[PDB]
Design a protein around this ligand. Structure first.
Ligand SMILES: NC1=N[C@@H]2CCCC[C@@H]2CS1
Length: 389
């Protein structure tokens, strides 16, 4: 069951995001749009900006409808404001449909559009509960499903290159696949394992155990999900609650201790470099996250490698060295399984059956000695108790 129209429709990288081509308005205006499972607004640049090569021009669209309502969206870093409306929307390398969707026309922003990232808007794929200004603003995917025969499911294969890409190479390179309305079975190996969507707001899941090279981190499982755990393509890092983060870094440091790295490396700010080809992957441990399964008392685990959690970055001296930043960082808003984790796996957002599937990605970076894994089942008890209230 192939989806050749959708395979390879993404570009980008974990640092700047993965984006899909979309069109808005009549005649169609083409824009690059960030695929974001961590938010629920479809918002596009709609006025000139130094980091935008193009933007939505509502006065040039005959199908534009003005909702006469403003919207303000602050994040931790950065923010934007805009004006709500509706227009006709298509995904050229997607299903063959056009739908009328809500669009936030971004008229002012701060630290949102970053220099050189290539996207001109964001596609929030999560649920109405977290849509701004409120849950009456129907999200794009909800409109798509309501107005067409597209099944209520999409899947993502984000492909990390394993090495840096300049803006030129990012433009020329295939960065992965967003399969709308289905599962392309060629994008993964082994089996798909499903975890329940705890609640439809973010794509919230429940982590029940964490291992570093097989060694149980041994925290009360509520700590892993405090105050939620989500799957989020619009966040770069694996983000861990403060207490889990501190304990994981201590374990990763202990496992990797034949080499010492400065504190700024572990804080995710400073790069570390090795001579070309000599990255010592084997000194870094694998990390396993166990997730609640669909069957009572059952869990499965996903396992990533340093090739996922060390993010390739360009050198300050631009040498031939292979350089990386540590892509695990602390959070005060729960666990975020961001792009560097998703690059390990084909991830199926099965909205129709309220679950999220994971399988080893056919494009994951690994070495001759170890690969990412998705394995199960494990007998686990009182998993309900891992969720925060
Ligand atoms: N998943 C997230 N989405 C929003 C919008 C896209 C840029 C990054 C922010 C913060 S985290």
């Amino acid at each position: 069951g192939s989806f050749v129209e959708m395979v390879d429709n993404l570009r980008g990288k974990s640092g700047q995001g993965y984006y899909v081509e979309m069109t808005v308005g009549s005649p169609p205006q083409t824009l690059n749009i960030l695929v974001d499972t961590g938010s629920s607004n479809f918002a596009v640049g709609a006025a000139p900006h130094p980091f935008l090569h193009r933007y939505y021009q509502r006065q040039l669209s005959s199908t534009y409808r003005d909702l006469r309502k403003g919207v303000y969206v602050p994040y931790t870093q950065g923010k934007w404001e805009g004006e709500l409306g509706t227009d006709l929307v298509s995904i050229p390398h997607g299903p063959n449909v056009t739908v009328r969707a809500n669009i936030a026309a971004i008229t002012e922003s701060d630290k949102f559009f970053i220099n050189g990232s290539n996207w001109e808007g964001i596609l929030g794929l999560a649920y109405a509960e977290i849509a701004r200004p409120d849950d009456s603003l129907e999200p794009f995917f909800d409109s798509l499903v309501k107005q067409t025969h597209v099944p209520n499911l999409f899947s993502l294969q984000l492909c990390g290159a394993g090495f840096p890409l300049n803006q030129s190479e990012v433009l020329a390179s295939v960065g992965g696949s967003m399969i709308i309305g289905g599962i392309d079975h060629s994008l993964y190996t082994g089996s798909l394992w499903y975890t329940p969507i705890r609640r439809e707001w973010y794509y919230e899941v429940i982590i029940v155990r964490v291992e570093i090279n097989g060694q149980d981190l041994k925290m009360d499982c509520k700590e892993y999900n405090y105050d939620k755990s989500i799957v989020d393509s619009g966040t770069t890092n694996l983000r861990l609650p403060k207490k889990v983060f501190e304990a994981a870094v201590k374990s990763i440091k202990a496992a990797s201790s034949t080499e010492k790295f400065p504190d700024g490396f572990w804080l995710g700010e400073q790069l570390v470099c090795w001579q070309a080809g000599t990255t010592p992957w084997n000194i870094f441990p694998v990390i396993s996250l166990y997730l609640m399964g669909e069957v009572t008392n059952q869990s499965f685990r996903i396992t990533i490698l340093p090739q996922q959690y060390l993010r390739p970055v360009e050198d300050v001296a631009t040498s031939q060295d292979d350089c990386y930043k540590f892509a695990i960082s602390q959070s005060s808003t729960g666990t975020v399984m961001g792009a560097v984790i998703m690059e390990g796996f084909y991830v199926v957002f099965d909205r129709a059956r309220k679950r999220i599937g994971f399988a080893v990605s056919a494009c994951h970076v690994h070495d001759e000695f170890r690969t990412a894994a998705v394995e199960g089942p494990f007998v686990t008890l009182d998993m309900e108790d891992c969720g925060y209230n």
